[PDB]
Design a protein around this ligand. Structure first.
Ligand code: HEM
Ligand code: HEM
Ligand code: HEM
Ligand code: HEM
Ligand code: K7M
Ligand code: K7M
Ligand code: K7M
Lengths: 145, 140, 144, 139
């Protein structure tokens, strides 16, 4: 459902992402911006301030891990494949995360990318990423359907 | 209902945006129209192509409203009451669309404010645009 | 749906006045969520609740659409076939925000509770919430 | 939002609910727990089966806060102040969950108010619960 030019805009930016750092930034901002999400990470320790959250080692450690090898191909096009069944089960059946948070975190990642790439994160490049965040979000909510 | 820390953070972002407010408001709109094409049906009489003078002109008006909200943050209901009736009664803008443009306004700010768009300032900006949106939906 | 849920859904749906409930549900959407009026300009007077509810085009549209999901004889234990067309219509042509699919479903549920009272038990509502979520997701597929 | 006509409608509905408010509060919750199971994780210490005494008791507290809101409709922010800090700061209630309970409260009302739940009253009640939800998420 991505056109070649959307896949292009997505892959050429992702190419330049420090995947080791953007996951931590994204998760951290989620915890800081939507503080109800801290609920699901009370085992991470100190989330008491912005500085505590963004400097928390488990935050950064969890961010890097998840956002990790999600790369050459990523999201969908990984030579077929790439489904979220087991993650939907985890996030819906086990954790009971409202799927709205899947949309929020996608929006935060988009904010992170815009921050890191500035002028390069153009309106068309953003539109392409919005479809990916919508696609991922919907996939993770498959059990709520 | 914002804290003094959030007010401080919104004023810092505003200061740094400076006279680019109008330009950034244009860009936010373009970002919304491409990202969220459903929003385009509220502007059938606009050319929504890049460099459109209608989007530039409208982006200025949106910026001016946001700048007014910044300037009267403790009494936004009064500041934006007119705009609230217009969006609700005249235009009947679907409330979900405020969230869509708030997101695009945040991304625009993020793309132009590398030092200013810290997690704390991001949170404060999000709350500011949620307050604006709450007020512009208040007439439903 | 579990057999328990289909049971709850079909047993109640058997007793629905299809004619009335369609018009009722649409009318209340227009009244409760007045931004939705934007898509029904051709219907004329939607100025007050009484005008909305009494409006012939509203009640006729409600009846046409819901009249195609039965009250007995199959429909409301379907899967995923007719929704493809309606998804293209609602998303690609009308550009209805999908949130409005959940709201309308929620309105249909309010209509049902109102007409059935104590019979619309919390378990029965639960089953109807899965339906309206299932229908909402189907219609939103051209956005996904 | 809250127009005189909405205040009039909300009072009319409150009069007919009468002393059943607590009981309707309980019913709303059970409606929410069954319809929206993600909401249950906020009440691990509750027995949420039908007839639970904790759901009954929690129902009265909910209804008590809603009638407090009705009684101070013109200054809900001041009225519901502590409650907003409780749900945000301590309880970390995801704001989406206010819509879900609001919807169950509407459904409950619809199920008990044959005459009163007209289309205009439905709109007024939705607006009322949306204001309460705005206050409770304000923090
Ligand atoms: C929207 C996209 C998201 C993706 C792609 C995603 C992906 C993942 C992945 C890969 C894991 C690790 C699974 C494993 O270790 O086996 C995970 C774990 C987790 N996610 Fe997410 N996630 C997302 C959103 C969220 C959100 C919004 C929340 C909470 C608000 C959340 C909370 C968690 C938690 C608590 C865990 C750890 C579970 C555990 O170890 O027991 N996730 N996620
Ligand atoms: C922060 C949120 C918003 C602000 C501050 C804002 C501000 C404004 C202002 C100042 C105007 C008046 C322009 C004039 O006087 O000519 C206006 C008009 C309008 N707004 Fe918004 N707005 C917001 C959100 C939205 C959203 C989300 C939509 C639709 C998706 C929307 C659609 C419109 C439309 C259609 C007009 C009339 C435009 C015309 O025909 O020229 N607004 N808005
Ligand atoms: C949520 C479940 C919904 C279902 C099952 C549904 C079903 C239908 C059906 C069967 C039609 C008739 C299509 C035809 O004539 O071939 C229709 C038309 C229409 N629906 Fe919906 N609908 C839903 C929601 C909505 C919502 C939420 C809106 C607006 C906010 C909407 C706006 C319309 C409009 C404007 C038409 C007229 C299309 C035309 O004749 O030009 N629908 N819908
Ligand atoms: C109209 C909306 C709501 C109202 C009026 C309301 C009212 C209240 C009241 C009065 C209390 C007890 C305060 C006390 O005794 O100190 C409370 C506690 C609580 N509420 Fe809410 N609430 C609402 C929405 C929500 C929602 C959506 C959730 C979602 C799960 C929720 C979860 C809780 C929890 C977990 C408690 C603590 C109960 C305990 O541990 O015993 N509330 N609420
Ligand atoms: C929230 C995390 C995974 C994640 C997903 C996207 C961006 C950053 C982190 N799930 O555990
Ligand atoms: C809004 C209508 C269809 C409808 C669906 C469910 C209940 C009432 C009406 N679409 O045109
Ligand atoms: C309408 C008011 C508030 C209310 C009380 C219980 C359930 C829903 C709403 N009646 O007491």
């Amino acid at each position: 459902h991505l056109t070649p030019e959307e896949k292009s805009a997505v892959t050429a930016l992702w190419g330049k992402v420090n995947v080791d750092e953007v996951g931590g930034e994204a998760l951290g901002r989620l915890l800081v911006v939507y503080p109800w999400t801290q609920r699901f990470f009370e085992s991470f320790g100190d989330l008491s301030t912005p500085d505590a959250v963004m400097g928390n080692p488990k935050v950064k450690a969890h961010g890097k891990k998840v956002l990790g090898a999600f790369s050459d191909g990523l999201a969908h096009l990984d030579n077929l494949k790439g489904t979220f069944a087991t993650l939907s089960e985890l996030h819906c059946d086990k954790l009971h995360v409202d799927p709205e948070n899947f949309r929020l975190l996608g929006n935060v990642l988009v904010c992170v990318l815009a921050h890191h790439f500035g002028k390069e994160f153009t309106p068309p490049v953003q539109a392409a990423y919005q479809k990916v965040v919508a696609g991922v979000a919907n996939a993770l909510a498959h059990k709520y359907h | 209902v914002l804290s003094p820390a959030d007010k401080t953070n919104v004023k810092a972002a505003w200061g740094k945006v400076g006279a680019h407010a109008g330009e950034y408001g244009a860009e936010a709109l373009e970002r919304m129209f491409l990202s969220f094409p459903t929003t385009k049906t509220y502007f059938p009489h606009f050319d929504l192509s890049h460099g459109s003078a209608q989007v530039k002109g409208h982006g200025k008006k949106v910026a001016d409203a946001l700048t007014n909200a910044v300037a009267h943050v403790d009494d936004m209901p009064n500041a934006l009451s007119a705009l609230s009736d217009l969006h609700a009664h005249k235009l009947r803008v679907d409330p979900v669309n405020f969230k869509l443009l708030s997101h695009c306004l945040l991304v625009t700010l993020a793309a132009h404010l590398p030092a200013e768009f810290t997690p704390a300032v991001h949170a404060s900006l999000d709350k500011f645009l949620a307050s604006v949106s709450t007020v512009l939906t208040s007439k439903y």
